[PDB]
């Protein structure tokens, strides 16, 4: 009867589906704008749900401080959820952060612990572990890449929203893989709860195709790229390889060019990883196999 959220963490999701006019075949590419969220990214859903589970798990209690190594959207998602629910939070990340990002996080009240940019995510992960080890009783690390609350919340929210908003006629889901939680949880929701055998498509960088190489039985050779949000260089444990039907690779130039076309030709604001996801879905959408299929693309961030 009333729709008043008790705090900002509960306002996650219910993101919109917008049909693309200049991609795909006869309107078969439909995007889900996860930028329309608290903290302007997909990551608000797992920010909230890992905090919510840790409270019901008993692993995060009043006075306990959150510690998480993240240079990306997960830090902002956890920061605002922590402020909204009264938790202390430490974020470790390398010193390559945008300077507006630094001011944003400390504006949110984050205890920012910076590590050497040359040590990358590995240095920040190690410092986060060190901080927790220093006093395990005082801290909790949510571990976005392994925590099941990550894919669980997309099974409970992102998936059903796609099911509901397409009146069950979604046929393909195209999602870049960072933690894998999005593609994992959406697929479980639709293939298992809704029982429809859609084509689940993971997207990764041409530069670091560790999923493609793993599935083909080849040596994995991760490498650097500029598609921020995906291509971690390993198979994250929240990516369930068994529900992946296909892997598309997009290089950084194409992702950036596609993002620019999204803004100039569709009037949609989204990050480079959204461009990657749309490049992959557009490539598929002009295949006879998918000519008749409704493709839903995850746009992870603003």
């Amino acid at each position: 009867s009333m729709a008043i959220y008790a705090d900002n963490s509960y306002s996650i999701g219910n993101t919109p589906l917008v049909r693309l006019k200049h991609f795909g075949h006869n309107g078969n590419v439909v995007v889900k704008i996860e930028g329309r969220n608290p903290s302007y990214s997909v990551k608000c859903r797992i920010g909230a749900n890992m905090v919510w589970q840790a409270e019901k798990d008993g692993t995060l209690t009043k006075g306990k401080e959150i510690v998480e190594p993240t240079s990306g959207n997960t830090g902002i998602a956890l920061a605002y959820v922590a402020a909204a629910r009264g938790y202390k939070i430490t974020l470790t990340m390398p010193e390559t952060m945008s300077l507006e990002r630094k001011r944003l996080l400390c504006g949110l009240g984050v205890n920012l612990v910076l590590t050497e940019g040359a040590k990358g995510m590995k240095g920040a992960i190690a410092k986060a572990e060190e901080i927790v080890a220093s006093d395990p009783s005082r801290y909790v690390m949510l571990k976005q890449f392994e925590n099941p609350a990550n894919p669980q919340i997309h099974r409970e929210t992102t998936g059903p929203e796609i099911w509901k908003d397409t009146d069950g006629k979604v046929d393909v889901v195209v999602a870049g893989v960072g933690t894998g939680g999005s593609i994992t949880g959406i697929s479980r929701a639709i293939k298992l709860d809704f029982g429809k055998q859609i084509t689940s498509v993971a997207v990764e960088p041409v530069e670091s195709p560790v999923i493609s190489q793993t599935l083909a039985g080849e040596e994995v050779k991760p490498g650097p790229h500029k598609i921020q949000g995906i291509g971690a260089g390993f198979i994250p444990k929240n990516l369930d390889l068994s529900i992946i039907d296909r892997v598309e690779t997009v290089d950084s130039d194409t992702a950036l060019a596609t993002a620019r076309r999204l803004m100039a030709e569709e009037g949609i604001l989204a990050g480079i990883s959204s461009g990657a996801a749309v490049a992959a879905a557009d490539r598929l959408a002009k295949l006879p196999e998918f000519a008749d299929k409704l493709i839903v693309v995850i746009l992870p961030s603003a």
Binding site: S71, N73, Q144, G178, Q228, I230, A232
Partner: peptide, 4 residues
């Protein structure tokens, strides 16, 4: 090694 990413920004997630």
């Amino acid at each position: 090694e990413f920004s997630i």
